[PDB]
Design a protein around this ligand. Structure first.
Ligand SMILES: Cc1cc2nc3c(=O)[nH]c(=O)nc-3n(C[C@H](O)[C@H](O)[C@H](O)COP(=O)(O)O)c2cc1C
Ligand SMILES: Cc1cc2nc3c(=O)[nH]c(=O)nc-3n(C[C@H](O)[C@H](O)[C@H](O)COP(=O)(O)O)c2cc1C
Ligand SMILES: O=c1ccc2ccccc2o1
Ligand SMILES: O=c1ccc2ccccc2o1
Ligand SMILES: O=c1ccc2ccccc2o1
Ligand SMILES: O=c1ccc2ccccc2o1
Lengths: 359, 359
């Protein structure tokens, strides 16, 4: 089956086309991950997936989404990832990590603790920063502070330091989080970016933060290791064709700038939208980006049904299939998929201590 | 559903009736467990099971089944279990451990490496000990050395030390491995025990090693923590009624001797048998032992089908349902079972980082 064919990008080879997308656990303390993450990630790696992308990890304290988000803004934070990276590699999966900055969506409660912006008098909260002083709205009413040019220079450097740390911690795959309405996405979107300087206004100016950050990271990230990014290419805000054209154009610039693969998603920049949720609904858009930008892609949402993952690959809509929630339900989803798609010796998708008894 | 009703035994309370029986991983080195076991066990604990019984852990080096078996014959070996026990407790599952001695079935290859007795010239092998110098046969042709009275005294003390270590490592449930043809089972069975001293011949003599070991362990194992054992009550060797009567009588002596629950199994003492494998095939025999010995029981084989586990409990055939291989396939089987049996808020069988998104 296509889902179980290996994939080589740069010097890295994934044993199959199954990727576990970044999934926040909200279990870190002051950005430090712990045994929750270690067992969670090592367990997933043993499940069979070819690639495991660690959850959105903040490049700076204020870049966390919540007080439980992982961070890599110091060498001590990076050290915490070393044993985990080594465990993922021991399991045969490729260790990747998504570095990010929540922007105006930062300083929020854990999803099961309100999922909304933290109260001003809550000692856990902090000031949010963004391209412009405009709030997301809805459950995230906090108005962020408009970034100065020095703030921009600082955040870009935070991304560089985060990438450098990920590299030294042993990660073999990096993903810049330019999606889901966080800092990067908010600089590209006219909904959130009302700047009149070099970082706002035109397509070139709105693209600047993302392009400069990619270029800066590229200076420290190994040429032989996949350099990727997640990016929302449309919002489903009634401006889809114009937005998709600009997004595809930026994807072209990303490729020219050394991006090896793009994780295609939705913007989630503003709350007033009408997203047509459905199994593998991203397939068509991901395919268009892949074709018009001539860049490898992956996407997600509803690919937990093995046949859908297989179909998307065979139709060349995606190069890698990202399966998220199905892995929270069953860490060994890859084994389930192998059986479903009739892979030979499906149980050996898992380590011997398990495979021997399930064959 | 019955499967998700809590269970209290002594001072311990299991959040549900799902028990993960001991399952050898063959991943230890010189008896020392490592991160394979840590992630494996912590991951299972987070899956939702009320009780997690660690794999057969040797009370002595020669008591290991294979070179990859876990051991607890020294305080250093016990220390290795501490972080794991603490992780299991953090997940809300009760940490248990099966201490054992392979007897004549020791010094064998890992299942996926031959599964047979290790060659005499293999540097990894060792001399096996048993009640009598008679081989199992088949793939385990090695003739064990007949134990001296001092060997018996020594092994009993090894069990006491193992129990003492399990206690100090934090385990809240212990299971003496008197089944599957290993040392304990072999002392009870006339097939393997041809001794003419105090430990062989009569029912009382054949029961002696097991009863003395239980009593010795009882001196160091906390009164408020479940003291259990696994025992093969029949062989399916054409001597089932006579064997079952003696086994039930021994179960009565175990109860009188402080045993809180018995894990009912098959003897596997000799290879020439005809075991009627089938889903929940142990149900009837486990029920008979439970009824005739008036002792709580658990059993296994094929209970990975939720409805079967539920049915066995409702019929009072078992007090706890042991589910093994299904947990190797899916560490979150408890969540699958909750959904299958229509438990309210089934996703919360798992920790919040998972449950929130699966509800
Ligand atoms: C608990 C949870 C945490 C997530 N964390 C992240 C994240 O850190 N970064 C990101 O880009 N997407 C994140 N996502 C979105 C997922 O990567 C994925 O795209 C989404 O769940 C759709 O795939 P699925 O239907 O297979 O779950 C998360 C989703 C869930 C449910
Ligand atoms: C890999 C593996 C390791 C096992 N290890 C042990 C053990 O250490 N001690 C024991 O008493 N039984 C052991 N068993 C037998 C199981 O505890 C259980 O009784 C058996 O798998 C039947 O249940 P199941 O059908 O749910 O798997 C093992 C079985 C498998 C498949
Ligand atoms: O998939 C695997 C296989 C072997 C192994 C050994 C130690 C730790 C993790 C491992 O994962
Ligand atoms: O980028 C992100 C970060 C967190 C998150 C949580 C639930 C759903 C989607 C998400 O996307
Ligand atoms: O089920 C759980 C819930 C919380 C938790 C925290 C740290 C380690 C393990 C855990 O397991
Ligand atoms: O007591 C035991 C120990 C190991 C084992 C392996 C496979 C099947 C059953 C087993 O029982």
């Amino acid at each position: 089956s296509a889902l179980f064919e290996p994939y080589t990008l740069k010097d890295v080879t994934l044993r199959n086309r199954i990727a576990i997308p970044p999934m926040c656990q909200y279990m870190a303390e002051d950005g430090m991950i712990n045994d929750w993450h270690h067992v969670h990630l090592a367990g997933l790696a043993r499940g069979g997936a070819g690639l495991l992308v660690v959850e959105a990890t903040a490049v700076a304290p204020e870049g966390r989404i919540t007080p439980g988000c992982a961070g890599i803004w110091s060498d001590a934070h990076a050290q915490a990832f070393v044993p985990v990276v080594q465990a993922i590699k021991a399991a045969g999966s490729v260790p990747g990590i998504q570095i990010a900055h929540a922007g105006r969506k930062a300083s929020a409660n854990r999803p099961w603790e309100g999922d909304d912006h933290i109260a001003a008098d809550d000692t856990r909260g902090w000031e949010t920063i963004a391209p412009s002083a405009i709030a997301f709205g809805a459950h995230l009413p906090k108005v962020p502070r408009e970034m100065t040019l020095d703030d921009i220079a600082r955040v870009k450097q935070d991304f560089v330091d985060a990438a450098r740390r990920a590299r030294d911690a042993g990660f073999e795959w990096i993903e810049l989080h330019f999606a889901h309405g966080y800092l990067g996405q908010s600089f590209f979107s006219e909904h959130s970016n009302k700047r009149t300087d070099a970082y706002g206004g035109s397509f070139d100016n709105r693209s600047r933060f993302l392009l400069e950050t990619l270029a800066a990271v590229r200076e420290v990230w190994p040429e032989n290791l996949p350099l990727t990014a997640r990016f929302g290419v449309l919002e489903y805000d009634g401006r889809d064709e114009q937005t998709l054209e600009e997004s595809i154009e930026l994807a072209r610039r990303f490729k020219a700038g050394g991006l090896d693969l793009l994780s295609v998603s939705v913007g989630f920049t503003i709350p007033d939208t009408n997203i047509p949720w459905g199994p593998a609904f991203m397939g068509p858009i991901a395919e268009r980006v892949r074709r018009e930008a001539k860049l490898p892609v992956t996407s997600a949402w509803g690919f937990g049904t093995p046949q859908l993952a297989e179909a998307a690959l065979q139709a060349n809509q995606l190069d890698l299939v990202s399966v998220g929630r199905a892995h929270l339900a069953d860490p060994h989803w890859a084994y389930f998929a192998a059986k479903e798609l009739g892979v030979e010796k499906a149980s050996w998708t898992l380590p011997a201590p398990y495979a021997h008894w399930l064959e």
